Amino acid sequence: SDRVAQLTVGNSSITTQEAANIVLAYGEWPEYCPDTDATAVDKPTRPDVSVNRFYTLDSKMWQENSTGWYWKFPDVLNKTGVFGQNAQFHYLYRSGFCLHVQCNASKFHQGALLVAVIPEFVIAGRGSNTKPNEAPHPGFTTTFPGTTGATFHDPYVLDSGVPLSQALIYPHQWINLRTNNCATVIVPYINAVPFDSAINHSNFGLIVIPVSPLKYSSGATTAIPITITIAPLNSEFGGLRQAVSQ
Amino acid sequence: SDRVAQLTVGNSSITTQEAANIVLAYGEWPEYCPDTDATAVDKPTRPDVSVNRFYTLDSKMWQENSTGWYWKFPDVLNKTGVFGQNAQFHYLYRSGFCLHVQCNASKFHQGALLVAVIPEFVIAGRGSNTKPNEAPHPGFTTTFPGTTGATFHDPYVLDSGVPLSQALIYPHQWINLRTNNCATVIVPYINAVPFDSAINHSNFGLIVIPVSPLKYSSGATTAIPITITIAPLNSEFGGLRQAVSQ
Amino acid sequence: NINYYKDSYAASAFTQDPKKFTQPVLDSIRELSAPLN
Amino acid sequence: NINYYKDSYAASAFTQDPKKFTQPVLDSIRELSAPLN
Amino acid sequence: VETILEVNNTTEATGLTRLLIPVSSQNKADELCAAFMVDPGRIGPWQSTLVGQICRYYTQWSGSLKVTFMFTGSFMATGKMLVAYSPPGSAQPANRETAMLGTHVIWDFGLQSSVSLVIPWISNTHFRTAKTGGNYDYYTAGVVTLWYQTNYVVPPETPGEAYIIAMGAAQDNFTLKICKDTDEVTQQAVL
Amino acid sequence: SVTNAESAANTTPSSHRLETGRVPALQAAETGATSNATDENMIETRCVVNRNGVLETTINHFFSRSGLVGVVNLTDTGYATWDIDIMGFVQLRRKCEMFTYMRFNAEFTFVTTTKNGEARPYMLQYMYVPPGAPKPTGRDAFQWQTATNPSVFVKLTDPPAQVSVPFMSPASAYQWFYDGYPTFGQHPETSNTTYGLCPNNMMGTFAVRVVSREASQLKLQTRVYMKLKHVRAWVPRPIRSQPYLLKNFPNYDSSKITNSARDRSSIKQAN
Amino acid sequence: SVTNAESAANTTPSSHRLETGRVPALQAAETGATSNATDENMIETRCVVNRNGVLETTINHFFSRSGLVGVVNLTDTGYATWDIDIMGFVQLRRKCEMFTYMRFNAEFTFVTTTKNGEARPYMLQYMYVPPGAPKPTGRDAFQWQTATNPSVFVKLTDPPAQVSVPFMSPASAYQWFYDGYPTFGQHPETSNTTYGLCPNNMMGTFAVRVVSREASQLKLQTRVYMKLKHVRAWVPRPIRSQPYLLKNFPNYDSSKITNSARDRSSIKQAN
Ligand SMILES: CCCCCCCCCCCCC/C=C/[C@H](O)[C@H](N)CO
Ligand SMILES: CCCCCCCCCCCCC/C=C/[C@H](O)[C@H](N)CO
What we know:
This is part of a larger assembly, with two copies of chain A, two copies of chain C, one copy of chain E and two copies of chain F.
Chain C: E1 15-16
Chain E: E1 3-4, E2 21-24, E3 32-37, H1 51-54, E4 58-62, E5 65-72, E6 80-86, H2 96-99, E7 103-108, E8 114-119, E9 128-129, E10 143-147, E11 161-170, E12 175-179
Antiparallel strand pairs in E: 1-11, 2-11, 3-10, 4-9, 4-12, 5-8, 5-11, 6-7, 6-10
Chain F: E1 3-4, H1 59-63, E2 70-75, E3 79-83, H2 92-96, E4 99-114, E5 123-129, E6 151-155, E7 161-165, E8 174-175, E9 205-210, E10 219-226, E11 229-236
Antiparallel strand pairs in F: 2-10, 3-9, 4-7, 4-8, 4-10, 4-11, 5-6, 5-9
The complex binds sphingosine (2 copies).
């Protein structure tokens, strides 16, 4: 009554037979914007079925010498389906998310994955340069990876100068290959403004990081796949105009 | 209190100072589909602001030797804005329309325009051929003109073998250049099925036809523009999947 | 707490809730019981 | 608002009426109605 | 209070004829007529008005605006126009079907011919700084364009060119904050 | 009617209109009245409770800031006089000329500096000379006995002096624009040197000296800042767009008239 | 639930447990939840009434101390400007970057010293220039008339000036980390000079000059200390362990990454 679970959203479902508990980021449920916090005059749209379902991204390979992966979540679903079309045509966006990460293994493998969100996860530029007009800055495909993700260079400092030991202050879970084969984190809309654009601003970002490496004996399956399925709960869009991609 | 009028839908307005009355097609108002007539299981989406507003198409030229124009209305708004994006991503569609046609002139010009809708307006193929496997059929740009419209060849038979004298059984108005400078027709969703696709099926079609030609004296403005502004009242979409254009 | 100005930001200046950071889980886990069945 | 002087001009210091500038017309015009018949 | 905007502030313009938008008969349909930015604290047509010179004493403005178009022409000349406000995003629209996707009003020339397009408050933040350009393109408000719905028809023995007077004002939602200085006056020595 | 306001106006939800005869979009600008088309009759809108403060846009909050009214040079004659007129500088003059009539109090501040800039521990006397009172003719004359005139003794090493001035006009309000002549008789066609001079705005002279019997060897500038308070305004008028040329006259340049909107490429290009 | 606290938590007496099924020691760290094993279920303990004060660990008591925000050099151009950003020094920046969102007031203090160190009796004007206001272009320009900008006159022989600053952001809170771009359009792959620049944190310019008409011959440093008050915080995040390199960017060094724990001999030797 605690390890088996099923999450149905829209027309999509997710079943799991071994898992940890469902985390709720900062104890708040994602709901629609009230009339007190709202500031835009035009009425928003609410599909509530076509945009609130489980979108699955591609699979990342789990090997022995991996470093980690990170995504920018309001930017990964800008090319997929009706959510992407609404986020391209509209100008303001507000929604919560629900992130499931599946990485199953046998009873002879071992390892550990830290899966956490960071609100306003800023990428740093590696390089010792104290002059502001010459220092190295990250590219557009490094800051906004998209539906294909991006790997780390230094997971010890989260590519931001911040130790990943203290990354447990964020909403997080552990994929330990002997306890659970998946992780789930529900996240509300965390921002200092009621509505914001879903094109040039990414609220948060997931990070799967190998803490304990993947080890096994000869004969076991080598390549361990990693899949992430996400769901934009309670989506709201505003400011309908011409479609822009970026 | 009868000739001045203003129609506001969504974020768009239409003002007129000389006009006829507002026609209502078959005395029925366009409303949402009830739970009795509905048959699809998945929940539809209702933007209600971004898709219910006034879309303006390009202007057609009003000369002395014109014949007429026709549009297929669920197919003209398949490339314009959030309505077009929803009609491309979704699979089922149901809405009513509100069609305004502006053609203003001075007090020295004269003419007459018949503006009417035809539910299931089928284009005929001109040519005397009784063999079914060789007869001439109309092209794709003749059946589905789009946001650029298409001109008639024989307005006397509506390009369908049907006399346009009897075209007054349809919901219609007259743009007489001495009484009104515009026409308006509100149309409900007239179809034998509750939901239908807005890509390979056009419910109805407007037809502006010069009955009395445009005449004037030397010195008056020659080229008389014609504009049509339409509004998809009470739009509903269903069956969200990959985006298709045609 | 006396203020001498019309504006309240020129003035002079025990709530705790650790259960949203320590245990932000949906299904509540007990103390004496095992966390997972 | 305390004053330390006999004269009141040495002291220290929401009415709106835009209808005398925006619509200073004799015959009042309505919102939904046309302005001139 | 409505106040004539200087939309025709281009070159090769005389003193007063900067206040008029010329309208004439076309040959091709859907043609564009005029366009201008909405930011009142920005150099352009919103500088000859009165809300633009008062919101230049204040740093942050808020609320909805209003633009009234009056048609100065002959009584026998008719026509239609499409005034379309477009929120930020891409540049000025190139077609009329692009402009219809925004917030538009279709206005015909009749017995009243004094239309008023409202410009609603569509912003992310509560306020907007009255300083635009460069790194301040985050506070732009959009573009108001004026197209040709059908045409400017006209009978014989009637002039074939008329003018539109555009005026601008605020609404009851208007709000101003943080008093700053203006940059219209300059002084070297005492007068 | 008169309505109060703690914040800006709110918006109510609106739906689509489909009917004839109700046209909130067609106005009449020929009637000399502002359009009244609101958002609830133009586009479908939502409901917001707008709690933005409109309190700091009133006349009192707009005028109660100390600007600059006059610099008085004392490049030591022994004394320095200054006719009191607030039209010397074009920063406060514009705000004051936004209105036709104004009735207010004043709060003068005197900031005195030296040649380069300094505060030498000397003594300064500021004296107000009302219209008709005898103006001092020397640095040690009897007009500085101030048996009835308001005078202020301050040092250069003191904080800047500050006084409060009441409404001292014989009329009911100060008018910044006066369409008429103070005198009678035949007026000339060539040069009207008295056109637009309201006698109800001349308030007197402001004199300043260094309290001494010998002659102190320093030159100093004293700046007079005014903060209006308890202000009331009447008959608003447009704001000046041409550069200023004179103090008491609204003169401008016939040639080289500056346009009130900068030039662009064409009317069809909003960029 | 929300619980109040006047002191720390107390302890209750405990005895030995001898039973099966009741295991307060086995947790599950995979569930993303902190362990809740208390002392009363781990070891036999006594009862204490802990009256230790936990009052001085709140956000208000942690942030209401005047640090250092900015040094402005005036090695007299005649004036000195300073863009207002509190990320110049790495002492207060760390405490501020412990959180993601902060909403607070400010209390600036201005301590001005001379070349070696001194207080010469001169005059100084500090002026705040909001975003959009004209920045002074000289030591005697008209931008120093401050008809609407807040300005402060102080002497070097006076106590340090002090003002209180409200929440002046257009957003609802100051965010120290912004994952996005202020503008639109195509963004480059080589050098993103605009990544991570929140426009809701740029607050304006702080200018300073010596009130004079000649040119005083002194060089001086003015220090701007900020004391936060009425502070609220949101979304705590870890504290930086790498050295700082730039002001507006969280840049670090790819090579030479400093470890967050100093080295010892082995893992089996706690000494
Ligand atoms: C020396 C200490 C007392 C100083 C007394 C000076 C105050 C007397 C003058 C009152 C000023 C009233 C405000 C300005 C008056 C008129 O509007 C100006 N002449 C404008 O032209
Ligand atoms: C000269 C006397 C008045 C001085 C007025 C200066 C106060 C105006 C600036 C307000 C400072 C707000 C606190 C810091 C703001 C932002 O967080 C920083 N830019 C951080 O980058």
